[PDB]
Amino acid sequence: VSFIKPYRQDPFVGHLATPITTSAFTRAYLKVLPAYRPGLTPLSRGAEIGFTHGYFLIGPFYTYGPLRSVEFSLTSLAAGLLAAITLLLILTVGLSIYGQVTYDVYDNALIVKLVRQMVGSERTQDLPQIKGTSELDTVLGWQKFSEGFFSGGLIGSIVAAVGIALYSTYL
């Protein structure tokens, strides 16, 4: 037996079907992640990603910041929370500008078919081309994704701060 084969029977792609790229564990694990989980609107994907990211982002800032405390301090928690929230704001700014400069679409998975059927004799790159058919690959989709990331980041950072305070106080 051989556990490495050309990806999708194409020996010319710059890719391989290894026990890591195309394993059943990899398939299921990546399909349960918010970025690829089926049945999620882009706002929901952004909200979940932001929640998880703020939740694990408050950690390093609170623990190793400039205002640490070997005991529990409200000032240390506030400093870590503010740093995490501002980092989430910076990431949201990056997401917003990236989406602004990347896509020009409001409804995908159709425009591609329209220009593959009804011809696309225009300036292209909006009618024709169009990389990716996901709802995340639109101006509207990425805007809602960034909004969800930002809101979920705030909520997750607050939740993680509350959990840290409870763990440090009642344990």
Partner: protein, 162 residues
């Protein structure tokens, strides 16, 4: 008790009680899943039993080297995290089980690459199954001996309580 993998020399197609002679393919897939999960968990349990007995670096020593005693000494908030990790792993396994072409114990998805399996692949799967069975028997014996005697594996062996 089929052309299934796991038939070794000492007892080929070992079904003395005929559990598989009447079961359909789905029940046999369930049986293989249960056997493989038990074998893997038992291999981990036996290795942990021994290593814990002669090495417990974590928790700043303490956590008495006898198993079934350190079971009641872990902070019980580390128990919760292990439980949640096992639960997430088995949720992922459940998600794997609905992938097309799924095989009972195959969570790596080897059916994607292994069409027309060889004798080496079958032999390695049988090796895993037999090691799992031996580890199941060994961990059952470990737990029973520690319950009845009160000493751990390398402690009972060292003293000579055999």
């Amino acid at each position: 008790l089929d052309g299934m993998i796991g038939s070794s020399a000492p007892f080929k197609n070992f079904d003395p009680l005929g559990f598989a002679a009447k079961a359909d393919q789905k029940t046999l897939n369930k049986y293989r899943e249960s056997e493989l999960k038990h074998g893997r968990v038992a291999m981990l349990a036996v290795l942990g039993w021994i290593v814990q007995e002669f090495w417990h670096p974590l928790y700043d020593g303490k956590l008495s080297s006898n198993p079934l005693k350190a079971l009641t000494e872990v902070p019980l908030i580390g128990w919760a995290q292990i439980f949640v990790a096992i639960n997430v792993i088995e949720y992922l396994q459940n998600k794997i089980k609905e992938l097309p072409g799924y095989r009972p114990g195959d969570y790596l998805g080897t059916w994607e690459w292994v069409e027309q399996s060889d004798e080496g692949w079958d032999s390695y799967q049988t090796k895993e199954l037999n090691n799992g069975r031996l580890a199941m028997v060994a961990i059952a014996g470990l737990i029973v001996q520690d319950l009845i005697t009160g000493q751990a594996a390398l402690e009972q062996i060292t003293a000579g309580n055999t």
